Design a protein around this ligand. Sequence first.
Ligand SMILES: Cc1cn(-c2cc(NC(=O)c3ccc(C)c(Nc4nccc(-c5cccnc5)n4)c3)cc(C(F)(F)F)c2)cn1
Length: 264
Amino acid sequence: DKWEMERTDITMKHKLGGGQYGEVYEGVWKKYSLTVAVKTLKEVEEFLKEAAVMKEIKHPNLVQLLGVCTREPPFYIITEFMTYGNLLDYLRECNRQEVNAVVLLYMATQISSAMEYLEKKNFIHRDLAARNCLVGENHLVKVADFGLSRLMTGDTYTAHAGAKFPIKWTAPESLAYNKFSIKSDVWAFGVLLWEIATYGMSPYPGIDLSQVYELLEKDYRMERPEGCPEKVYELMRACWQWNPSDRPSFAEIHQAFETMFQES
Ligand SMILES: Cc1cn(-c2cc(NC(=O)c3ccc(C)c(Nc4nccc(-c5cccnc5)n4)c3)cc(C(F)(F)F)c2)cn1
């Protein structure tokens, strides 16, 4: 296994994000004095599944697997470390003059490119959201999956069907039937686009979780955010079509963002 690496090659430092990611630590890969992120096992089959899945996925806009220590405990998964951290906090904390409308569009385009690649792989993300994306230099954005549903405080994730779901990002068939697919990822992408356009406001503001499904079923959808371009809102609306087969593919979504970005 070319992925196995020397646990000793890594100096472990502090928990990242002051603990909001669980057992993930800042590390230095001494061999290259490279700051990395290291997820450790504090659920063994689930952790090894994560590592195996990450070996088969590779894209400029997906978080980069660098290695694993799974030959003996405690197991590690090591990825690149993204300077600016998670997209949700980034948006909330940014200088909006720097991170302006053209930049927002560029972020969305990058996310759609990763999703297009995952769609080509028949890979189902299941938890697409700003909280699961990372920001690097020059507004580089990558999709990731921090396995947040058991750690996160608040009512982001709530009890549903025996697990915890981010109800407000979840497609109606995924809520009702536990049916997840590339098209439920498209639905969540539309919510992500609204997160981006509002610089990380919480979706369906003020609307209790217990009422969301019934509203959606009556064709209630979030309104266009202030200053979100019309074409971008049109794409949100398409992503939130009730019937999954009515939603666009990520190939179509990426092409549309590419065209809009070219024209800006
Ligand atoms: C069974 C299974 C697994 N996955 C899946 C796992 C991941 N993993 C991580 O992103 C992940 C794993 C380990 C580490 C160390 C990291 N890196 C990490 N985790 C938390 C925070 C940070 C961080 C914070 C601030 C600055 N830089 C990095 N990095 C990511 C990523 C994906 C995705 F999105 F790409 F498809 C999918 C899906 N199904």
